[PDB]
Amino acid sequence: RKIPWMLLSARAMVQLGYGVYQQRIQATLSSHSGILGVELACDKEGTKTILQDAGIPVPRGTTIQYFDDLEEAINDVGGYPVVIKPLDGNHGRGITINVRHWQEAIAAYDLAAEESKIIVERYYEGSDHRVLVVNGKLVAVAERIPAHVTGDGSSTISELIEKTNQDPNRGDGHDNILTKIVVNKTAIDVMERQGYNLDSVLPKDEVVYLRATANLSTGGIAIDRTDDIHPENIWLMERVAKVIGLDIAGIDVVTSDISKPLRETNGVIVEVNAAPGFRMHVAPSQGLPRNVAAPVLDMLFPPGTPSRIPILAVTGTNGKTTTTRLLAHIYRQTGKTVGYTSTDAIYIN
Amino acid sequence: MKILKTLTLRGPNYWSIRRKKLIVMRLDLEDLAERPSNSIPGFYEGLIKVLPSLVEHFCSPGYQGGFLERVKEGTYMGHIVEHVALELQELVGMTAGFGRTRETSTPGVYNVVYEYVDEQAGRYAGRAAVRLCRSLVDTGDYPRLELEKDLEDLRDLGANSALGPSTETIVTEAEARKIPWMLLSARAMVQLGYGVYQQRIQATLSSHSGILGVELACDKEGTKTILQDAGIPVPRGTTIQYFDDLEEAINDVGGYPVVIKPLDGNHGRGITINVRHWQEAIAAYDLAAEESKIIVERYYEGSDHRVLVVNGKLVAVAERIPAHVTGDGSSTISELIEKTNQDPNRGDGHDNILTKIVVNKTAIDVMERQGYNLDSVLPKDEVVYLRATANLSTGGIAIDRTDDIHPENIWLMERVAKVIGLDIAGIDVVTSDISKPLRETNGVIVEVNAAPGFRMHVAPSQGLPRNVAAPVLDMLFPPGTPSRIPILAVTGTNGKTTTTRLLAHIYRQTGKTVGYTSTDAIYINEYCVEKGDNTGPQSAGVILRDPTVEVAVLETARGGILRAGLAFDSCDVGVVLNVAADHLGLGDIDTIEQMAKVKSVIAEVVDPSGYAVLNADDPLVAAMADKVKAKVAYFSMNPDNPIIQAHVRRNGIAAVYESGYLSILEGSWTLRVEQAKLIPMTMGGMAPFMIANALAACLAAFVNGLDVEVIRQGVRTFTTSAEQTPGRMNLFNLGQHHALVDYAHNPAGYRAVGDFVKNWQGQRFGVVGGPGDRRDSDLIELGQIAAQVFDRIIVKEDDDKRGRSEGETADLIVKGILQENPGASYEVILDETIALNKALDQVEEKGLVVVFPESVTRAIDLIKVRNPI
Amino acid sequence: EYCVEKGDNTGPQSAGVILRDPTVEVAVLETARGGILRAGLAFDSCDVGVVLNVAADHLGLGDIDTIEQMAKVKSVIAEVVDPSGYAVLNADDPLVAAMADKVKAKVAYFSMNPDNPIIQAHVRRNGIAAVYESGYLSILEGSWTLRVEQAKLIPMTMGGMAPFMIANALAACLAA
Amino acid sequence: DDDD
Amino acid sequence: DDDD
Amino acid sequence: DDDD
Ligand SMILES: Nc1ncnc2c1ncn2[C@@H]1O[C@H](COP(=O)(O)OP(=O)(O)OP(=O)(O)O)[C@@H](O)[C@H]1O
Ligand SMILES: Nc1ncnc2c1ncn2[C@@H]1O[C@H](COP(=O)(O)OP(=O)(O)OP(=O)(O)O)[C@@H](O)[C@H]1O
Ligand SMILES: Nc1ncnc2c1ncn2[C@@H]1O[C@H](COP(=O)(O)OP(=O)(O)OP(=O)(O)O)[C@@H](O)[C@H]1O
Ligand SMILES: Nc1ncnc2c1ncn2[C@@H]1O[C@H](COP(=O)(O)OP(=O)(O)OP(=O)(O)O)[C@@H](O)[C@H]1O
Ligand SMILES: [Mg+2]
Ligand SMILES: [Mg+2]
Ligand SMILES: [Mg+2]
Ligand SMILES: [Mg+2]
Ligand SMILES: [Mg+2]
Ligand SMILES: [Mg+2]
Ligand SMILES: [Mg+2]
Ligand SMILES: [Zn+2]
C-alpha cells in the first residue's frame, strides 16, 4: 500500500507513516488499543461479570481461595462434569477439562493449587472456535482441534503416530504449516484417561487425543469456518468486542455447531483476548488463507487519508542553505508547522 | 417498633422528583401507636439529653423552635424516628434533611421516608434510630457508649464508599455540564454518557489513553532513549547491574555531584540526591541495591516543577518545595517545627490544604547532612529541609506558576507529551527559572508520568486554584457533540406494550439501532437479549449502557417506579396513555387520585426542550399539563374535543382521528398520515383502542422530528400476529367461524374487546372466558359487561387453579350477567378446555367467539383443533 | 476598519445598514435613547444586551422627566434579549441591578467591588460575574476564578488610574 | 421538595 | 498505584 | 507474552 515504515529504538515498536500521520504498532497491539479494554480483558472474573450483565452467555461457575471446598462448589455448578483451572494464569497449564469423579477433583485441585489465588465451572460440550474481530467487525473464524491419531486401519497408537508424523507438511515451527507430534508423559496421561496406551490397536475410525488443548504449535490443526457462521452469531461477537472495549480481539467460543445460534446449541463464550495472534487465520491447515492485515491497516489509515507529509528536497553545489530557508519561510505563511534541516541547525516553526 | 420492609430509591419517584436518594421504611408501631409522647413518662428529657443536637429541625411549624415543641405535644413515635435517622447521619458529616411520614395499612403502620448520602450508611441510621427511640420509651436514657459506637460505624460506612479525589473532580464538572454518570461493576470504573456516546474513566486514565504510551512512560530507560533521539534535554547518566562499579560510572557522568537511584521503583524510596564523596556513594549504593535491577546521573541544580498537559496542550504549572523550617527569629529547629505545625491550614490529609510535619529518623538523617539537629538555633533566614523530596502529603508546599512560563518552554512540553504518546501527562522538570528557556538555565526533563494526580493544581498552597477537569471533559465530549441518546418513555394503565413495539418499529425504518424494553423481553434491532418481564430500572440500564444503541424506547410500569425510582433522570418524550383503577391497594396506592401521581412522574421528568404527550379524552391525564415544564402535545378520538381546539388555536400540535384518517393538526394545517382501515394493527378500523395507540405513537415520532413518510411506512408494515404478540388480539379464521384470543385483566380490557365484538361484521357474538380468583369484587361488573355485548354467554369460572373454593366465582358472574340482560343463552359449563371452547359450532356461520382464558398458551393451542387458516 | 459612513450613526437607520450587509458575521451596535424614543429598535431580539448605567442626563426631553422614567427607556434592551442569551448588568448601579426582575434571559453581573452582596449571592447559585480584584480584571464562574489581565497593562486604562475605564473593560470582557 |  |  |  506504499506506507513507509521504521523501527524505533524502544520496546520493539514500529512506526508507520510520517509526521502528523504516524501510527505505531507492537506485534498485535496498536496506537488505537486502549488500556482499560486491555486490562479488563486480562481479568477473567472482571470480564465474566461485565458480559453476563449485558446478557451474553458465559459458563456457570465459582471461586475458592485454595480451601478444600470443592466438594461444596460442585453443588452450585450442578454436578460433577466440571472444569478446574488454576486460579490465575501461567500459560495453558494446570487445567483439568472434564472431571467426573471426586478423586479426579482432588487430583485436579492439587495441580491447580500450584498457582496464585474459576475453579469449578460447568463443563460444556462442543468444539473450540476462534473468532477474530478488528474494528467492531468480524474478520475470520477458525476451528481448532488438538493433536490426535485415528483408527486408520488396524494399527497401534505408536505405529499411527509414526505414520502421520512423516507428513511433508509437518516440522519445526513457522517453517511449515504443521509441527510434529511428540510423545511425552503428558501424552501418556491424556491417553490413559481415554482407556488407551501406545501398544493398543484402535477400532476403525476411533479418535485418540494426545493433548488436552488445541494449538498449532503442539501438533494440532486449524480449519477455516469463516463463511459458515450464522448472522445472529456474527452480531453477538461484534457486541462482545464493543462491551469489553477492544479494537483487535480474539474470542474463544465453545459450540457444537457454529452455523446455528448459540442459544440453540447451548454454547458459551469462554474467553476474550487482547493482542491475539494471526497464524491460524493466515496459514490454516484446511481451507483458504485470509488477509488479516488489510482490515488493520484500514482502521489505522482510513481510505482517502494520507500516510505521508510533503517533502521538499534541495540539493546542488552552491546555494542550498539560502534556498532552504526561503522556501520554509514561504510555507510558514500558510499557518502550518514546518520543519527543516540545514547546515546551521534543525528547526521547527 | 418493628421494621417490616425497606426500599432504596435511586432516581425520580413518587415522593420527590428532585430527591433522588431516599430510603422508605415500613414501620410497625406495635406499641406507641396508642401512646403519643405524653403517655410515655420521661420521653422528652431522655430524647434531648441523648441527642442534644435535635434542635435546628423545623418539622412542620416553620421556625427553629419547630421540632421538640411537637414532642411536648402529642406526636407519635413514627414521626420521631424520622428526625433521629436524619440526625445520626448529620452527626458524622453526611448531610441529609428531607423526610416525611404517612400512615398506611391498618392503624399503626407508617411509611417513614428519609434522605441519604451513602446507601449503607442510610439504612444503618434508620435501624439505629429505631433502637435509640425504643430504649427511651422503655427506660429514660440511652448509654453513651451505645451512641458512640454507632456513630463510629456510620463514619466507616461513609468512608469505604468514597470516590478518590481525582474522580470526584471529574464527576463534579460532569454534573455541572449535565453529563450523566454511573459506576460500573468492575475495576472501579465510571461511565459517562449514554449508548453510543459513552466514555469511561478510572481515576486519571481514560478511554483515550493508549497502552503503548502508558507502558513507555513507565520504562525509565525507554523514555530517556526516545526523548534524547528527538533532541529533548534529559540528564546525563548510566546503568550498573549491581556490581560495585560506581567508582568508574562517576567518570562517565563527569564528577561526584551525582544521583543514585534504585534501579527500579518502589515508591519514592532508596534515592540519594547529591553525592559528593566516595563514602557517600557507597552508602547510597547499599540502599539503592535493595530493589530489582539510572544509578549515577549527573546532579542538576534548580527547583522541582510539575507541568500538566491534557490534549497536546498545556493546562497548569506548579512549583514544589519539600517540608522545611526557617530562621524565623533566633529559635531552635525543634521550636520552629512546633511553631509552624500549629498553622490552621495544616492537618490530616485531603481535609485541609497542608499536612503536618513529622519528625522521624528520616528527618534527622536529612538534617544531619545539612549540619543541623533539633537543638540548633538557626541564623536569620536560614532554611533547613526536613525531607529529601517534595510532596504535599509529607508536609511540603505547592505554588502556582502557570502564568510565568516562557513560550518556548510551553512548546517543548507539548512536544514531549506527543513524542511519548500520552493524552493526560505530568512532566517533571528541574530548573532554576521557569520564565527563561531551559537551554539558558541548563535545565532538564527528569520524568514523564501517565495518570498524574490533580491536588497540587486544584488546591495549591499559594496562588489561584485551576479547573483541571474542564479540559478533560472537553476532549472526551468535544463542544457541539451530544453525551446522550434520545429516550422515549411510555406509561399508563393499559396499552403500553403495544405502543412501545409500534414506536420502536417506526424508528427502526430510519436505519438506526433501536433498543427497547417491554414486559415480554429486551430487544436490540430484532434480536432478543433477555426474556421475561423486563420492565423496571434494571432493564433500562442494560439498554443505556449498551455501546451500540442510538435510540431507547422504554415501557415504564408502576411497580418499578414505586420500588426503586426511574433509571434515567430525564427524557425527550414522555407519553401518558391513560389512568384507570387497576392495581389499587398495592404499594400503598389506594385511590385513583394517588395512581395519577404515580403516572405523572413521567410527564414531570421531561426535559424543558422536549414534549409530553397527553390523552385529551382522559380527565386525569389532561390535568397533568399544569405540572409539566415541557411542551405539551395532545391526542384524541374526537376532533371536537374543546382542549384540542383551544390548543391548536395557540399554534400547538395534536393528533386526531377524523374522516377515517389518522391525522396531525399543526397550527392551521392538517397532515393526513393514513387510513385506519389500511393499518393492520387496527382490526379493519373496528378496534378503537388500537386506533388510540397508533395515534400516540405517531404523535411521539412526529414531535421528536421524524418525517411523515417514515411514519406511514412504519404503520403500514407493523404486525401483531399470533406468535408475535400472544394474547393480544389474536384473531383466528376457522371454517365459517372466527375466534379471538386476548388477555384482559382489569375491566377496561373487557370493554375494549367488547367494542371490537360489537363491530364484528358477521353473525352471533359469543364469549368463552372470564376472570380468575385474583380479582377484587368486580365480578358483577365483568358480568354486566358481557351481558351488554354477547348473545352466547357461557360461564366458566371453576377452573384448574381454584384460588378460592370452587365454583363461587362462576355463580357471581351469573348473578351479574342475568341482572343486566337475561337473554344470552346463559349456560354455565365450567370446563373451559374441552367443552366451552370446543363446541363452537353452536355459533352461526361467520359469528365471533371471544376467549378470555386463564392462559393464552393453552387457548391458542386449543383454538387450532379446528384447523385455522 | 473601513469607514462606510461618517457622523452620528446611532439609531435604527444605521443598524439596518449593518444588518442588510451580505458580508457581516458579527454586529455590535451602540444604542441611544434618541433612536428608541423616536422610532423603536431595528432588530427585535438580540444575543447580548449590555446596560452600563442610568444617570440624569437628557431629562426633560422626549417627555422623559424623571430618573425612574429614564430607567424604563434603558430597560428596553434588557427585555429584548432572547431567552437563550444574556443580559449584562452593573451590580453597582441600583436602577440597573433592579432590571434583573424583568429579564427573561440569563443574567450576568459586573462590579468594581468583589464584596458586593449581589455578586456573592449570584456566584453561590453558579452564576457568572466579572470583578476588579487584586489589580486584576477577572471572571468568577461558579467557584473558579479566571484572571484575564492586570489593569496596569491594559492601555485604555490610564496606568490603572481611571476607574471608569476599568468598568468599561469589565463589561466588554464579560459580554465576550 | 421542602424539608422535614 | 494510580495517582502518580 | 504478546501473541495471545
Ligand atoms: N467450561 C468449559 N467447558 C468446556 N471447555 C472449556 C471450558 N472452559 C475452558 N474450556 C476449554 O479448555 C481450554 C482452556 O482455555 P483457558 O480459558 O483456561 O485459557 P488458558 O488455558 O489459561 O490459556 P491458553 O489459551 O493459552 O491455553 C480451551 O481450549 C477451552 O476450549
Ligand atoms: N548560486 C549561488 N547561490 C547562493 N550563493 C552562491 C551561489 N554561488 C556561489 N555562492 C556563494 O557561496 C556562498 C554559499 O553559501 P550557501 O550556504 O548558501 O551554500 P551551501 O550549499 O549551504 O554551502 P554548504 O555545503 O557549506 O552548506 C554564498 O554566501 C555566496 O557568497
Ligand atoms: N539528575 C537529577 N538532578 C537533580 N535532581 C534530580 C535528578 N533526578 C531526580 N531528581 C529529583 O529527585 C526526585 C526523584 O524523583 P524520581 O525520578 O526518582 O521518581 P521517584 O522518586 O522514583 O517516584 P516519586 O516521584 O513518587 O518520588 C525528584 O523530586 C526530582 O526533582
Ligand atoms: N387503551 C388500550 N390500548 C390497548 N389495549 C387495551 C386498552 N385498553 C384496554 N386494553 C386491553 O387490555 C390488553 C392490554 O395489553 P397491553 O400489553 O397492551 O397493556 P400492558 O400495559 O402492556 O399490560 P402490562 O402491565 O401487563 O404490561 C389488550 O390486549 C386489550 O385487550
Ligand atoms: Mg484461550
Ligand atoms: Mg558543500
Ligand atoms: Mg548548507
Ligand atoms: Mg412532614
Ligand atoms: Mg517524580
Ligand atoms: Mg399492569
Ligand atoms: Mg407491558
Ligand atoms: Zn417533622
Short mmCIF file of N, CA and C and ligand atoms in Angstrom, two decimals, chain A residues 128 130 144 252 270-271 273, chain F residues 4, ligand 5:
data_model
loop_
_atom_site.label_atom_id
_atom_site.label_comp_id
_atom_site.label_asym_id
_atom_site.label_seq_id
_atom_site.Cartn_x
_atom_site.Cartn_y
_atom_site.Cartn_z
N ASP A 128 -13.78 -26.09 19.94
CA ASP A 128 -13.14 -24.83 20.26
C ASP A 128 -12.94 -23.92 19.03
N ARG A 130 -12.18 -20.09 17.32
CA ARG A 130 -11.59 -18.77 17.49
C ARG A 130 -12.14 -17.78 16.50
N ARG A 144 -10.46 -25.15 15.99
CA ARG A 144 -9.22 -25.75 16.43
C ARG A 144 -9.40 -27.10 17.08
N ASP A 252 -12.88 -16.69 22.23
CA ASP A 252 -12.93 -18.14 22.36
C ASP A 252 -14.33 -18.63 22.64
N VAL A 270 -16.19 -18.40 26.26
CA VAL A 270 -15.26 -18.76 27.31
C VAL A 270 -14.26 -17.67 27.62
N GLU A 271 -13.72 -17.03 26.61
CA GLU A 271 -12.70 -16.03 26.85
C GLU A 271 -12.56 -14.92 25.81
N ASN A 273 -9.53 -12.21 24.35
CA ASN A 273 -8.09 -11.95 24.28
C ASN A 273 -7.63 -10.71 23.57
N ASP F 4 -1.34 -13.74 21.91
CA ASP F 4 -2.27 -14.49 22.74
C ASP F 4 -3.16 -15.44 21.93
MG MG G 5 -7.79 -19.39 25.32
#
